[PDB]
């Protein structure tokens, strides 16, 4: 895969987590687990476009394990000694729980089905129009948030299972261009087929670069 674009912040993480494999794998509570533990990303998403998906490796359990986005105004170690959902508790953060429910602004909205060990979850972000999209097991679930203009964000994950970890496998970014918007429009006009290159004689090089840029768009509907 193409080199990932950000790591979990070495200087910004809760007082109970260890990081490994060039920080690609983050591990939560290798002993007592007596509170919530959380981390942020290093790169800011306020400009351009972004996309990344996270692969799970450990059995799921506990109060809540959630993947989402938020600002830097939220504190990490405020729940160092308490079991709680940190993501989505305030208007400045969002979160999707493994139980198939979404947290935002301190409320709960059921969004999708549950997932656990071995599952792959994908998130698509479009800051220019301020819309956010979630993907699961290389399938489309649906749009979750919109009207997020002028706001700056970092990616966060929160955990509460001991003996458990999460692992970012791919991280890339791109700028707004015709290779973004026109191909999204084409996929909206070609949702039935799994592949979109069929019937298109366009050069293989631009084909491969548009894979590396928006592979899900050509392979998702």
């Amino acid at each position: 895969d193409e080199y990932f674009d950000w790591v979990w912040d070495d200087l910004n993480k809760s007082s109970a987590t260890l990081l490994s494999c060039d920080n690609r794998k983050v591990s939560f509570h290798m002993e007592y687990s007596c509170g919530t533990a959380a981390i942020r990303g290093t790169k800011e998403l306020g400009e351009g476009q972004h996309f990344w998906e996270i692969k799970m490796t450990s059995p799921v359990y506990g109060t809540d394990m959630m993947v989402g986005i938020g600002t830097s105004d939220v504190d990490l170690d405020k729940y160092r000694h308490t079991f709680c959902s940190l993501l989505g508790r305030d208007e400045d953060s969002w979160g999707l729980s493994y139980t198939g429910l979404l947290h935002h602004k301190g409320d709960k909205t059921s969004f999708s089905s549950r997932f656990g060990q071995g599952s792959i979850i994908g998130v698509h972000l479009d800051t220019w129009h301020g819309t956010l999209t979630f993907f699961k097991n290389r399938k489309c679930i649906g749009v979750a948030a919109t009207k997020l203009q002028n706001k700056r964000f970092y990616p966060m994950v929160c955990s509460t299972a001991a003996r458990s970890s999460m692992k970012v496998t791919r991280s890339c970014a791109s700028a707004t261009s015709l290779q973004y918007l026109c191909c999204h429009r084409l996929r909206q006009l070609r949702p039935d087929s799994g592949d979109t290159l069929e019937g298109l004689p366009l050069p293989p090089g631009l084909k491969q670069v548009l894979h590396n840029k928006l592979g899900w768009v050509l392979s998702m509907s």
Binding site: Y32, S33, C34, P59, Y61, G62, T63, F83, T160, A161, A162, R163
Partner: protein, 362 residues
């Protein structure tokens, strides 16, 4: 991690046979007590509520502390509420021809459970010395309902309780309970709705004192009956392929609750919780999910978690409704302190998030 749950299940299973080996001693003792009571005039009609299963066991890891419940049929009575509790009742004898089981306990206009238990103790003490092939000692009181405690030699201990019975129709206070219609269809609901109900004695207490003479509805036989015939159809678990794991998920939770109390026995702050609360929550859960397809042997995991999540949410919201009296709130602040409630929430969540560390000591 269902491997640990299956392993502890087998470990609990392997000690099943030792009960019947020692059951003969207690069988003989309760038989001698039964004949002794039957020669008396006060309790000429006392019988056995579970013939063929003549013992009841409350603790899942206490093969030496038996429990037995004697039934005592009563022909015709009238009941009334106490200060609008909707779970505690009085009793009265309304009209009968010349047939008096025992009216000498009638004081004022209430049959006296205090005198009931007072004579009940005296009969047991005057009888117990008659046994000569086994040393038996009768131990002090521990509660309103288990007013008698019987200890055999040193190991076997039994507490005896008594209950009344009546064939009259169930009162209107339980009209909305037992929402089984979606689970086992209304036909079974209607036929079990005419089986008798049992009134056990239980004192009422307040800040300025305690009011001793009060009764309470009991449904242990029906509670066992649904669990015995849990299947949506007659054929559930009748073949090796269709087995369902409804039964194990309750004995699992009893063991957890007993273990937590054992580990925190010093401060005694968790001594107000029993297995009744565990059983009620599981019954609510299975009413919520009546389909048999949700209880396959493979998973066990989502069902145990649903049980613990339901109990946790009930504990947080301070709401727990009795399965037969839908208005009764056992978790109300009148009975259980919020301090102990939050203590138990903290402990249960810690165990859930640490993957039940207490089960590893076994």
């Amino acid at each position: 991690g269902a491997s640990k749950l299956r392993a502890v299940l087998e470990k609990l299973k392997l000690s099943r046979d030792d009960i019947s080996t020692a059951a003969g001693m207690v069988k003989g003792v309760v038989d001698h007590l039964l004949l002794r009571l039957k020669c008396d005039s006060a309790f000429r009609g006392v019988g056995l509520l579970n013939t063929g299963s003549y013992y009841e066991h409350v603790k899942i890891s206490a093969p030496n502390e038996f429990d037995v419940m004697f039934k005592l049929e009563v022909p015709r009575i009238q009941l009334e509420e106490y200060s609008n509790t909707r779970a505690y009742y009085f009793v009265k004898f309304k009209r009968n021809p010349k047939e008096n089981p025992l009216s000498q306990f009638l004081e004022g206009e209430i049959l006296s459970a205090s005198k009931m238990l007072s004579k009940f103790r005296k009969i047991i003490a005057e009888e117990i010395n008659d046994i000569k092939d086994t040393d038996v000692i009768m131990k002090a009181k521990r509660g309103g309902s288990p007013a008698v405690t019987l200890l055999i030699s040193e190991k076997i201990s039994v507490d005896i309780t008594l209950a009344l019975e009546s064939k009259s129709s169930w009162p209107a206070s339980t009209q909305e309970g037992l929402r089984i219609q979606n689970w086992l269809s209304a036909k079974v609901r209607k036929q079990l709705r005419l089986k008798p109900f049992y009134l056990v004695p239980k004192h009422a207490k307040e800040g300025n004192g305690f009011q001793e003479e009060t009764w309470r509805l009991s449904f242990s036989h029906i509670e066992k009956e649904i669990l015995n015939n849990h299947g949506k159809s007659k054929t559930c678990c009748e073949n090796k392929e269709e087995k369902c794991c409804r039964k194990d998920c309750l004995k699992l939770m009893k063991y957890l609750l007993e273990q937590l109390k054992e580990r925190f026995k010093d401060k005694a702050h968790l001594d107000k919780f029993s297995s009744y609360h565990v059983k009620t929550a599981f019954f609510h859960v299975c009413t919520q999910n009546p389909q048999d397809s949700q209880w396959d042997r493979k998973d066990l995991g989502l069902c145990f978690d649903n049980c613990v999540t339901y109990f946790l949410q009930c504990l947080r919201t301070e709401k727990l409704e009795n399965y037969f009296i839908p208005e009764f709130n056992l978790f109300s602040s009148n009975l259980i302190d919020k301090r102990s409630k939050e203590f138990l929430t903290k402990q249960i969540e810690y165990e859930r998030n640490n993957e039940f560390p207490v089960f590893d000591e076994f």
